[PDB]
């Protein structure tokens, strides 16, 4: 990103729980699987819905 | 007139959280308090150390804390002030202070915000702005190069962005430790 | 400043003095570069000034 700089501490959780991610840094070793197929996407978003409802 | 405070009154006890690296300052403090005992075997002291850390880390007082531990003449002023809007007098303060140090040794020079002089000359700014900045930075180069380890004067630079430093001040034998 | 213009002036002039002769400027790319519309640096000033002198002399 075209970043910034502020005098703030680390956010309560959302910036502190971002410590478990390991983002990607080099561009030529990025993996992105082929996007799902709107019949697989149906079942995956349905799993998301089940989690939220529970 | 250059801000030279005689004896400081800032101690090695009144800064906390930097113990591991503090050793360096303590070691340097012995060299400058006793410049002849390192003339014993020839242990080479630092030409000048540039204190680095993003602002708020205390780069100014911990240098002044070295000054307080040694009670040596502490010479401080802002490097950014070495480029006032008049050509030729920026370098004048440089020479003045360096002969002041060579006279009131054993002393320690400190100039926070010198990378304002040592940030790499931009390819987008006005030359007239960079010309006397060029002249002042070359004054500092040649002067502190003209310094000997035996003059008993330690140099301290301070800034927050090490990456913007130009490779001329990044020379070993000019700024040995960082 | 002005030194490049005086230099090309002296070159072309003394060349005209000992005519007929031959001039050879290898790598005019550093001097005959197309003038841009951006950049207020002295280098551009001296370069295009030498370019003007080069022009008015050769024509």
């Amino acid at each position: 990103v075209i970043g910034q700089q502020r005098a703030r501490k680390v956010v309560s959780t959302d910036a502190m729980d971002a410590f478990a991610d390991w983002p990607t840094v080099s561009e030529d070793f990025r993996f992105d699987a082929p996007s799902p197929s709107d019949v697989t996407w149906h079942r995956y978003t349905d799993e998301v819905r089940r989690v939220l409802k529970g | 007139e250059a801000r030279k405070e005689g004896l400081t009154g800032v101690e090695f006890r009144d800064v906390a959280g930097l113990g591991p690296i503090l050793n360096e300052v303590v070691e340097v403090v012995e060299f400058l308090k006793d410049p002849g005992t390192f003339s014993k075997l020839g242990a080479r002291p630092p030409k000048g150390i540039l204190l680095e850390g993003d602002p708020g880390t205390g780069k100014t007082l911990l240098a002044k804390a070295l000054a307080g531990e040694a009670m040596v003449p502490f010479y401080q002023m802002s490097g950014t002030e070495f480029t006032e809007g008049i050509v030729g007098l920026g370098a004048a303060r440089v020479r003045d202070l360096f002969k002041r140090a060579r006279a009131t040794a054993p002393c320690v020079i400190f100039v926070d915000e010198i990378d304002a002089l040592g940030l790499r000359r931009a390819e987008n700014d006005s030359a007239k702005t960079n010309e006397e900045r060029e002249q002042t930075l070359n004054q500092l180069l040649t002067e502190m190069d003209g310094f000997t380890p035996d003059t008993g004067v330690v140099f301290l630079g301070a800034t927050n962005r090490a990456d913007l430093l130009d490779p001329a001040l990044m020379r070993p034998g000019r700024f040995d430790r960082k | 400043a002005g030194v490049a213009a005086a230099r090309v002036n002296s070159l072309f002039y003394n060349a005209r003095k000992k005519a007929p002769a031959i001039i050879f400027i290898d790598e005019i790319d550093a001097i005959g570069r197309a003038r841009s519309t951006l950049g207020g640096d002295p280098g551009s000033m001296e370069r295009e000034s030498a370019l003007l002198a080069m022009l008015v002399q050769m024509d």
Binding site: - | - | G2, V3, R7, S10, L11, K18
Partner: protein
């Protein structure tokens, strides 16, 4: 002096700096030569004819 010091500095700075060849470089009695002609150039037949004429 005080005035023509900078005149000398100028015409030194603003002197001719082109190397002169095929004129009498008789500082010692020489004349600078390059030493290649239209025979030690093998390939640009068209260019050599153009410059010959």
């Amino acid at each position: 002096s005080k005035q023509e010091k900078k005149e000398s500095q100028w015409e030194r700075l603003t002197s001719s700096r082109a190397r002169e060849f095929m004129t009498k470089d008789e500082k010692t009695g020489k004349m600078r030569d390059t030493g290649v002609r239209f025979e030690d150039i093998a390939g640009m037949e068209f260019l050599v004819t153009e410059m010959r004429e």
